[PDB]
Design a protein around this ligand. Sequence first.
Ligand SMILES: Nc1ncnc2c1ncn2[C@@H]1O[C@H](COP(=O)(O)OP(=O)(O)O)[C@@H](O)[C@H]1O
Ligand SMILES: Nc1ncnc2c1ncn2[C@@H]1O[C@H](COP(=O)(O)OP(=O)(O)O)[C@@H](O)[C@H]1O
Ligand SMILES: [Mg+2]
Ligand SMILES: [Mg+2]
Lengths: 371, 371, 57, 57, 52
Amino acid sequence: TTALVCDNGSGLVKAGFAGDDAPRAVFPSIVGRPRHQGVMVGMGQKDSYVGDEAQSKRGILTLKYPIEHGIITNWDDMEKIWHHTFYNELRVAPEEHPTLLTEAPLNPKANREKMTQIMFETFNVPAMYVAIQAVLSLYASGRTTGIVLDSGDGVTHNVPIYEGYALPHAIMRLDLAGRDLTDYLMKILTERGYSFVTTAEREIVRDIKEKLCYVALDFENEMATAASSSSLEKSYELPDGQVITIGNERFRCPETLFQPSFIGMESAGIHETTYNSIMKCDIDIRKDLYANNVLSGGTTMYPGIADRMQKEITALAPSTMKIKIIAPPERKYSVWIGGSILASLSTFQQMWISKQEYDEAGPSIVHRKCF
Amino acid sequence: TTALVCDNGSGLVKAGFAGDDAPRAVFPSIVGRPRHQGVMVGMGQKDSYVGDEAQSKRGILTLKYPIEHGIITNWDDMEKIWHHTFYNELRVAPEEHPTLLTEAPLNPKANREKMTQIMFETFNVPAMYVAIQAVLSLYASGRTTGIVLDSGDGVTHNVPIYEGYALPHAIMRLDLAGRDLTDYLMKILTERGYSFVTTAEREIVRDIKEKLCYVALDFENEMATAASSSSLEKSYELPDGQVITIGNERFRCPETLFQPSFIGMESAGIHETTYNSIMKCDIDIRKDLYANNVLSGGTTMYPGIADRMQKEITALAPSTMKIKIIAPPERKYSVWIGGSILASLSTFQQMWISKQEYDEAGPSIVHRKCF
Amino acid sequence: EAEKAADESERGMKVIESRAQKDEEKMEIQEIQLKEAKHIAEDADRKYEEVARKLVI
Amino acid sequence: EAEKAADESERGMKVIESRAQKDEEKMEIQEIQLKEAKHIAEDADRKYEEVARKLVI
Amino acid sequence: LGTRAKESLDLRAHLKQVKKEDIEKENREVGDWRKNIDALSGMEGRKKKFEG
Ligand SMILES: Nc1ncnc2c1ncn2[C@@H]1O[C@H](COP(=O)(O)OP(=O)(O)O)[C@@H](O)[C@H]1O
Ligand SMILES: Nc1ncnc2c1ncn2[C@@H]1O[C@H](COP(=O)(O)OP(=O)(O)O)[C@@H](O)[C@H]1O
Ligand SMILES: [Mg+2]
Ligand SMILES: [Mg+2]
């Protein structure tokens, strides 16, 4: 039979059968209970709208993501999300399909063990396998080397790989991602008068960020230009009218990636954690990693980031090496495409964690040889 | 058995069995004791004529409404009105019929508790339920969202509802209604020479208001036109002859709705309390409320109000949203039609306040789960 | 009273008739516009595939 | 007779209003679809210009 | 698009169906009853009792 390549993510759940080009169903991972009282009788009001249904009734819900930073903080809601994904968005019972979840690097063990225990006890799948979210993104590019920066919505991690041999001592995981950029944008919008507070209006700020923000090639020059002319002010129409005008908030929101001091984080930007991740590698594979830097994940879709990052790394790196940044147009679904490719391989067909194996060793089987 | 859908109202009591299209008996709610001496013996003169009987002998009575502004100020008279409604206008003993009263929002608790205590002790009904007068008017329109402006004769209230979830923090109750318009019309008629003082002549002024007054589309232009031409002066024949001619009093009486400063009230008109009630709602359901504005209640029957209100709200609201005002031709009985629909539902059949429940918790049961 | 009510009811009926006709007109206009939109979309899609091929080469 | 005339006019009015409301719903659907189409157009143009830049470089 | 339109239309149909059932059950079944007379023009019977 065919395998189910699910990809929990944090912000958008992407799923679909193995062997295709794009995920079959992509929908936000939010579960929102209603918060008001409700007076109409017999309206058929449910107790929790999940997935894309709660992005249409969000006016009277309190949306809450079940995955904070890679890790899962609310297991009941995550179980509800998985149940919805299997039964309503794909309509395939899990009793007859292997599953291939994905997990960020350096995550707590208990999260992974609980994930496998749920998949084997509640949904009762035949066999499931957990894979690191960066190796898949490297599969999708058709490479076999390279250092991949997978800046998702929950957590940004940077896994270097050479000739198929991952370097476990050079993984640099940073917890700045799309959600913190949304919060920072929502916080700097208040400097013009627009106040978004409700958890429903966070979605509106996210839409503003997606449609308007861009990464500046040079920050100081853009700050000077936006403060003199008015060629940058782009307007946007809220879900009820009252258009708003975003000035130099456009390139200040995604600039937080390269200067995490804006949101008070100490660490260095995504332009310098990649160079540090390279320098921890051996001295003889640094040229190949320099030449095959891969971008993935949703947050790396800002217009103009593949040039800013290349300029920064070229500034840091030695002058002789060639710096090349691979930015495929299908960046958002790169991890899932790689997952489909991996699940479609014949050599991989014996790596699944078969159910009888789980029955013999318990949920701690995932840390064992079947990784 | 069938349920009795009574609707106390203030000015017209509307009642009838559940499941029909129109109330069976509609009659003014006035109780008038005779005031003169009376010399004929054996004429069979009663001590209080209630309902529609006192609108024919009103020449020698002192009519007094038992409901001032939604609240009930004279419980003995209200009990008399209910007794008349049950026994003479419907001729069904209340011992064998559930009842569904209606109550304005934000009313004193003691009024509701006394109402249920009367219905359970004096008339001894099997089970009664109290419902907010605006949710029913939303039922009758066949919608499930929308903000309903129910401008009755006692009190005008504006309850917004979305997807069946009422928003309790956005109810704007204003005490200007048809009765104050009658008093203001009676007060401005004195500018031509016609003086109505007796409580019986208030009914004549009410008839004048119903048959002649209309809401102007633009107030200043109408004031200028009525002061130059004479195309507006419509005449009306009193109950004894001596026709009267109403000039620019025609559109000045119902204009008080949009400018409550005429009768000295501070608050804003019904055109601006609706917009304020909308703006208190969440930012994502404002479009739906804009598109589904519902009118109900008797006082919203003035010829030309559904255009003036739309013009005013379109002036206030953002230019992109579409403003639509639902004004069904059966406006007056909208609340009662909705009450019949609600009482006819199967899902609602277990929400009644059964008598044994009242015996166990006292009259304070109404504020509890059985709302 | 009945005859005046009949006149007004026919008034409202005719008003709704005319409004519905206008709406049908707008519906068909938006319909042809939507078809044009779909065709533009397909053309853009083909161009996209083409340019991707060129860039890969 | 007049009452019956009024009733029939009412029947016509109710049916025609049902017609008009359905047409309006259709119009709103067409509006959203047109919006989506223009959105497609803009994103296509942006990506195409990007790939043009990369091609030339 | 078609699925969402179908769902919204079905919801509107359900609400209007409930309203229409409400219309069906009690519309004129106990509706307008004349309960009047022909004014009895040919009645030429009078009375000579005045106590009542
Ligand atoms: N076109 C875009 N432009 C800018 N940011 C985007 C765009 N699309 C998605 N994002 C950001 O990326 C996030 C989605 O990232 P995604 O790759 O789905 O995370 P995950 O790894 O959990 O799947 C969104 O929250 C959004 O903030
Ligand atoms: N055709 C009409 N035109 C103008 N005003 C009216 C008309 N019919 C009723 N009214 C006003 O509305 C009042 C009746 O309102 P109603 O809806 O019966 O109040 P309630 O909510 O108490 O039932 C009357 O006092 C009258 O002033
Ligand atoms: Mg990811
Ligand atoms: Mg009322």
